[PDB]
From Swiss-Prot, chain C:
[4Fe-4S] cluster 1 binds at residues 10, 13, 16, 57. [4Fe-4S] cluster 2 binds at residues 20, 47, 50, 53. PANTHER family: PHOTOSYSTEM I IRON-SULFUR CENTER (PTHR24960:SF79), PHOTOSYSTEM I IRON-SULFUR CENTER-RELATED (PTHR24960). It comes from Pisum sativum (Garden pea). It is found in: Plastid, Chloroplast thylakoid membrane. Its cofactor is [4Fe-4S] cluster. This is Photosystem I iron-sulfur center. The keyword Repeat applies.
Curated annotation (Swiss-Prot), chain H:
Belongs to the PsaI family. It is found in: Plastid, Chloroplast thylakoid membrane. It comes from Pisum sativum. Its main location: plastid. May help in the organization of the PsaL subunit. GO terms for biological process: photosynthesis. It is a single-pass membrane protein. The keyword Plastid applies. The gene is psaI. Keywords: Chloroplast, Membrane, Photosynthesis, Photosystem I, Plastid, Thylakoid, Transmembrane, Transmembrane helix. This is Photosystem I reaction center subunit VIII. The chain crosses the membrane at residues 6-26. One of its GO terms (cellular component) is chloroplast thylakoid membrane.
Amino acid sequence: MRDLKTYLSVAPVASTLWFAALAGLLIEINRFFPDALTFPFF
Amino acid sequence: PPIGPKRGAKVKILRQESYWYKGTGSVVAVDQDPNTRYPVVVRFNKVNYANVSTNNYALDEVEEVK
Amino acid sequence: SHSVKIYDTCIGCTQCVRACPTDVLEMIPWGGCKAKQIASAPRTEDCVGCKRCESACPTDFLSVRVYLWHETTRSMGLAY
Amino acid sequence: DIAGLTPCKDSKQFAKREKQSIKKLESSLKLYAPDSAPALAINATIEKTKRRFDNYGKQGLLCGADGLPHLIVSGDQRHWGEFITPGILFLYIAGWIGWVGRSYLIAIRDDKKPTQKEIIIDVPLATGLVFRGFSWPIAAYRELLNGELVAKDV
Amino acid sequence: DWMPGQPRPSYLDGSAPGDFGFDPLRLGEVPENLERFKESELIHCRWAMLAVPGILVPEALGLGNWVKAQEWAALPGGQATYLGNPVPWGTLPTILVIEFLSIAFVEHQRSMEKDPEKKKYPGGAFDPLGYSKDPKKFHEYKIKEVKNGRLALLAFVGICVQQSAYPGTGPLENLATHLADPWHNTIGNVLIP
Amino acid sequence: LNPSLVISLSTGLSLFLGRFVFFNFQRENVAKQGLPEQNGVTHFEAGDTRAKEYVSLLKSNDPVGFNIVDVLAWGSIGHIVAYYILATSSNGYDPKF
Amino acid sequence: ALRFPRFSQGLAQDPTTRRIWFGIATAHDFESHDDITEGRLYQNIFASHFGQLAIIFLWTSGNLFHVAWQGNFEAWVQDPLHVRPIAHAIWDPHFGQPAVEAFTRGGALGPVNIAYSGVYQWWYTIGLRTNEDLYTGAIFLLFLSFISLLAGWLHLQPKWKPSVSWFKNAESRLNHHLSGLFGVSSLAWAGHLVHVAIPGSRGEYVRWNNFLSVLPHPQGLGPLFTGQWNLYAQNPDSSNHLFSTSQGAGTAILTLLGGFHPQTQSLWLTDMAHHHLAIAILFLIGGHMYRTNFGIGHSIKYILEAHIPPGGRLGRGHKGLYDTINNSIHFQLGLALASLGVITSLVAQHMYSLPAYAFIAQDFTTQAALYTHHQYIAGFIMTGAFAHGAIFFIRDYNPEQNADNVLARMLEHKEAIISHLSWASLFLGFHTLGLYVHNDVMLAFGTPEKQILIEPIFAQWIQSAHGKTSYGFDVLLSSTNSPALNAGRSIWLPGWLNAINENSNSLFLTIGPGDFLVHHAIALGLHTTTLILVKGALDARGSKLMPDKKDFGYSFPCDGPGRGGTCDISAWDAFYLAVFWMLNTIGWVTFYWHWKHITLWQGNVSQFNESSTYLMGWLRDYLWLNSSQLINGYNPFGMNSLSVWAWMFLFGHLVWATGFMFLISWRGYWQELIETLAWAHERTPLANLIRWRDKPVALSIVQARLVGLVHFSVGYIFTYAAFLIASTSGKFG
Amino acid sequence: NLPSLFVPLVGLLFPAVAMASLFLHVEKRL
Ligand code: CLA
Ligand code: CLA
Ligand code: CLA
Ligand code: CLA
Ligand code: CLA
Ligand SMILES: CC1=C(/C=C/C(C)=C/C=CC(/C)=C/C=C\C=C(C)/C=C/C=C(C)/C=C/C2=C(C)CCCC2(C)C)C(C)(C)CCC1
Ligand code: SF4
Ligand SMILES: [Ca+2]
């Protein structure tokens, strides 16, 4: 169990989980706010 | 009398061709035998380009820094 | 032939002589280091320049230095 | 307007691009049935195209002779949303990333094997440090005045 | 002390005339530079104490501002007018060669003499009334001179910057504009246009 | 408007300044400047046969040492200033205020 | 000695073929030859300079000879815009009959090549009119090449070879170069313009027979000694003037009009004569700065010693820099190559925007060829400037004599300089590429409106500052109230403002977002190429990996596989890596220049303004589209005069790809292969009666890098030169 | 007519003489 959690903290797995969460967030941001060449809220 | 610095003290490496030049290391043993041109034994935190972590230096090649 | 030099930073571990593939290095008695021995290059006419000795030196910086010089049949490794 | 450009709400080429794009999608739409799923997909893309063009023309984007939004990064206050404002947002995020990673490297530099926590992440330590980047411009500025940001004599 | 709470620099003791401890950039770090600056400051101070009266006195009369009183040389056939009378040597080449020869000669005499206190306070022929008689009132007048000079230098900066904020104006004309409405005609309108 | 007038006045004033005004400053500055030197020694001593300064032409029975070269230098200043003044007066150029 | 090379014993005693190669590659490295002294060094350099001058004079002499013999110069003067100038004649016995047919052009009897160097326009603008004039210039330069060889030989015998002290006389050399070599030459050129070129440009053929009788000006010389020089500028040529004729001709010889001659579209010949005269007399006065044998002047040593800021932010300033440069010929060559490469690029940027030779702006193939030529020349010169800077640090830099001055301080913080050059290259590279990819993806998905097109508003603001109206920023020269405009309306501003806002020429072309992206690719290329050369020059004496690199020289293979591997660790390898980036940078520069002009000459600047913002547009609308007539130079159905470029086009692709073999594959593979070939020859009957007198070996590691780089560069230059000229001259517009 | 004499004289005879003479000098011994 502790060894399994230590494996999940290795560089590639932490990178995938972190970049997957990051990719999903940016996808939803461009899904609710598509296009946008500017910062429109001024 | 103990020539050179005490063992364990931090030393600023002054040998210009050293991988740890201008850096700092820790003393291991000071060879009190004269005619030994490089008595100061220093151990380093990071390995050099030959994966070596210890080297011998002269007395005028090391400076004691705290 | 290639020039080879030994500097007094040598600790006398006899590693350059073991790695040499053409028997150029020797171990002579000396009084400078703890092992009572230093290296010398008396047969650089057979030296090929592989720098296999420099790859094995633990001194920082190196105590064996191979300065590639005038090429000869022996230094070029020619069997023809 | 600026640099000879005309605002996209005034440009004819800008409106002609919106027309030709929508008419091109409509030309793809006639091939499918009105209740079809490709039809609702193409209709949604058309509505998304209208929304994009309208938003660009509404927020004061300048257009060239090509009918495409050109950005002005000289600092003119009429177009800070085109670079300076998103750039400040980036610099806030970039400083956050660098400051948190720096805090992590400082915290593990005194470990027995500092390389161990660099190839196997200490997630508890990371989760405790990720929110220090929220105040990174302050913590960094104070470390600048106190001599803690730069290593002495390197 | 020019800023209570701040420690004084090491080389500014408080003995020199005008030594209030002002050197944030440490420009007078070198005594050679500091002594040279002590001379150069009095030169700027004295040029300004001659400039400010000459800049605002003709404006009180019918003559225009100092910027328009140096305007005939722009056009070809210029003719200077001291007190409304066209002086015969009003042409620019005449005044230019006259000023070059005289100013270069006199100002170069200051270079050829290094004491270096003669470069600061010469006297002799330049002190006929003999105000340097008492070495206490003479140093008191040194303090009076450097403060009068710094005041005139700050005034010359004001005249030039006001001339930029109102191209083709007079310093006293700007004063009258401020007197018409001090609460609506202030630097705030050129600070916030 | 007269070339001889401008040239004589400009060259006369230039020679006058260089002899009586800008003379001691020029000589003390050329003394502390010194002769150009290669490898810490003059060009001639190093072995340049043609780098020996001509002290015979620098000989002048003038009381202060004004020789031919000083005349040539300050005279070239006077003529260049003279022709600058003449050329600036004949062009008829006028900016716009 | 004993055999070739006689200057290197170690190479002569080489039993392998390596003896020959290294004997050729080290012939001019005088400092490495046996028994070299400082005297022999400067003397061989001196004679080599004379030999080079002889080469240059002979080369120009030959160019005149062929233009006068097989060329079109006499016919080209009559129709400057309808006659294709001839380089020389073609005599290739491999030509088929159609090759003779298609290559016979320009109005000649046999096959000829159309000259694209611009010497026709150059010679017509300076006064040369007949083939006889070109023959006269060729004989004079052939005679000048002769006396160049004469002087070179002369100063190689004793009592004519100068001492090293004479070469180290820097003060006297600068005074003469500024006064005589720079000023007097420019003054005499202004004399040629006002005597032969300007009157030749007004119908008067002034030659050596009648130049003593004609007056360059009706009231000649007189006003020059009075100060009323303006009489030489009273009657310029009318804007409706024909170059070889006199309708509209004037009598002025020194003007400052500022624009172009409307007919020839070249700079005013009076403006050029006045220009050379003004800069000449400025060089003449400036050439009296340093001290010689007359007791006046400056000591460059003392000036360098005096420039030390108190407070020590520059340490000991420039102390010792005089002897540091005056003793190191590599330092002097580094400064010479640096300044020459800058002004070479300056010439490139000005000859296309300010054409000075009559009827050269309409010869579009010539303008493209000239700009490309000088930019690649300047790129190589810049790489050589930094190469010899590193060679100076290894061979000539004395650290104690440069103690704590600006030069040693460069080494003291080498990591700061190299790291920031790396940051700037990373910043430029990351973002410039990213924006290009973003726009590529947008246009892939058919959404051009989502591109990131940044307006180059700072350079647009500068163009408006020069009086251009296309952006309307209302600054000086573009605003009616600024004193910069009022002070110049009398003189150059009429002609200058008339030319800058003409939509035909290339004087400050209109720029858009595409130009913004390409200029940042240029910044990436300059920064990275600078990064490579500077990191190599500063790490040339040593690094943390090899702290004694200065002992191994400038060019060595490596330091072995030890300590992790040390491949390409010398400063020579840094140069070798930077030449790829130089070629890439100049490639970007010239792709930019050629596409903007080839769309301008076609009257279709919108295609460039809309397609240069994404890289698929560069591949499709520039390389692919313009290669049509080129690759059809010869097809299964025949050929035309463009076949010589279609062949050279592929020829350049071959040499370039051949260099990959020397750059990818390395030595040890080929050495073992040659061993298996030596056995084959010794064991083959009949052939074993033939014995090699030099042992076959594989090319050296450094030799391989050089040979691969040379194939790469030759293929680079030849491929682009073939495409450039064929795509431009195929349309001629 | 002159190209029919000088083109082979520099593309055939000249490289032949040049390559042969350079070969003899490079391979020569002392
Ligand atoms: C560097 C200048 C130069 C260059 C690049 C060329 C190039 C060319 N010439 Mg030419 N030539 C030159 C100078 C030059 N020439 C001079 C000064 C003369 C005397 C006026 C001639 C007379 C000449 C004739 C009569 C012919 C050519 C021809 C040709 C073409 C065929 C090649 C050839 O025959 O070789 C050149 C042959 C020569 C006799 C020229 C060499 C003699 C001069 C003095 C150069 C000195 C050579 C020297 C021994 C070595 C030079 C060192 C190094 C720089 C090469 C070719 C494109 C032929 C042609 O038209 O092709 C269709 C041809 O018929 N040339
Ligand atoms: C750069 C100079 C140059 C010149 C002037 C020539 C000239 C010629 N080449 Mg050649 N070639 C060259 C370079 C050159 N080449 C190079 C660098 C290559 C390598 C790519 C080639 C490869 C090549 C091939 C493959 C062929 C030619 C052929 C020919 C001939 C075709 C025209 C013809 O039909 O004539 C007349 C045709 C004849 C057969 C008459 C021969 C001419 C007499 C016998 C010459 C006498 C030689 C003389 C005694 C000694 C010469 C060497 C001496 C200077 C030491 C022609 C004379 C063709 C050829 O030779 O035909 C068989 C051909 O097959 N060339
Ligand atoms: C904490 C991570 C970190 C930090 C604070 C920095 C900081 C810096 N880097 Mg750097 N770098 C990093 C990681 C980092 N780097 C990594 C992993 C690489 C390998 C790809 C590089 C490769 C690199 C190069 C080649 C250069 C720099 C340079 C620089 C300096 C200029 C800014 C810059 O160009 O950054 C740019 C950043 C990158 C190019 C890559 C960054 C990748 C991410 C964003 C950082 C890693 C974050 C880390 C994984 C988070 C850990 C989370 C933790 C809490 C668990 C700057 C002080 C430049 C320099 O020399 O200064 C003049 C320079 O030339 N860096
Ligand atoms: C006036 C300019 C100038 C001068 C005087 C020198 C002088 C010198 N350089 Mg240098 N250099 C220069 C510019 C200059 N360089 C430039 C612009 C570059 C950038 C390309 C270089 C790059 C450079 C390097 C890397 C090196 C030198 C070296 C040297 C020294 C020895 C050169 C030698 O003997 O090798 C002889 C040179 C040759 C035999 C040339 C053969 C290779 C050429 C390029 C092949 C010809 C191309 C192709 C085959 C022809 C066209 C193809 C055809 C089909 C049309 C020497 C003192 C070397 C040195 O000694 O380092 C300490 C050294 O390694 N230079
Ligand atoms: C007034 C006297 C005088 C003159 C005229 C010269 C002239 C020259 N010297 Mg010399 N020298 C002199 C005095 C003089 N020297 C003295 C007194 C000494 C002792 C200290 C020396 C010691 C000396 C040495 C040691 C050397 C020279 C060298 C040279 C030659 C330089 C190379 C060259 O030709 O580039 C030409 C330069 C120009 C044409 C002017 C600059 C060019 C500009 C920057 C660019 C071109 C302008 C324009 C845009 C071009 C348009 C292009 C179009 C025409 C196609 C040159 C001809 C070198 C040499 O001997 O070569 C054999 C060299 O090694 N000199
Ligand atoms: C005896 C005597 C005297 C007298 C003296 C005299 C009088 C002298 C002189 C002198 C002089 C009087 C000199 C001069 C001059 C010099 C020079 C040296 C010159 C010059 C010139 C030039 C250099 C020019 C240039 C130019 C040209 C060429 C053209 C263009 C323009 C110009 C101008 C730039 C007395 C009594 C006093 C004293 C005692 C003695
Ligand atoms: S380079 Fe190789 S052959 Fe030469 S001494 Fe070293 S180990 Fe021996
Ligand atoms: Ca234009």
